[PDB]
UniProtKB/Swiss-Prot annotation, chains A, B:
Primary role: V region of the variable domain of immunoglobulin light chains that participates in the antigen recognition. Immunoglobulins, also known as antibodies, are membrane-bound or secreted glycoproteins produced by B lymphocytes. In the recognition phase of humoral immunity, the membrane-bound immunoglobulins serve as receptors which, upon binding of a specific antigen, trigger the clonal expansion and differentiation of B lymphocytes into immunoglobulins-secreting plasma cells.
Protein's recorded name: Immunoglobulin kappa variable 1D-33
Ranges where the record places region Framework-2: 37-51
Originating gene: IGKV1D-33
Organism: Homo sapiens (Human)
One MF term in the entry's GO annotations: antigen binding
Organism lineage: Eukaryota, Metazoa, Chordata, Craniata, Vertebrata
Length: 109, 109
């Protein structure tokens, strides 16, 4: 009944080029693999990188990767390119309404 | 097979407080009522206003409203509050991967 609440962390980070970035999310319930991870550059519609918790979209570099099960899932950027600076989102599609995470915003030092 | 492409218009508009705003989207296929309209204020995770093409989320003022069928759908803001200044998105959930529209960005004169 209540919308599956989605807990994303961190709310924001800073790393350096070549750094290993990992972003995690906890789900209020077992949303099974129904999780879309999106990327969103400033002033651009969101860009789906991963769906079904682990499959890459099309075009999407190997850098990015997603794992996890049930309630807890992880999004990992292997190396981090300067292009990679963005805000990263997640969304459950396990049950209407499909809910979004608060979002993690990548940042460089 | 190919991701349902989603055609949203306009890509950007300007109106005044009290103005009647309507935003339309064409779908590459009959995505049936599987359309989430989202709102997204600057620097904030997207905010779902409507799902199933026409049902309001929770909290969401009556101002907003959504209709349409098959491929063509319309999102309408009855009056337009200054709070309403944002970028508006849409997404099909009729078939994986759930695709986003280019997005309409509201704007005031």
């Amino acid at each position: 009944t209540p919308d599956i609440q989605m807990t994303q962390s961190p709310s924001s980070l800073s790393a350096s080029v070549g750094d290993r970035v990992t972003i995690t999310v906890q789900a209020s319930q077992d949303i099974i693999k129904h999780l879309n991870w999106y990327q969103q550059t400033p002033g651009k519609a969101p860009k789906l990188l991963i769906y079904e918790a682990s499959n890459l979209q099309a075009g999407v570099p190997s850098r990015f990767s997603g794992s996890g099960s049930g309630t807890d899932y992880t999004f990992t950027i292997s190396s981090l390119q300067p292009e990679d600076i963005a805000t990263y989102y997640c969304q459950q599609y396990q049950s209407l309404p499909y809910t979004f995470g608060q979002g993690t915003k990548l940042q460089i030092t």
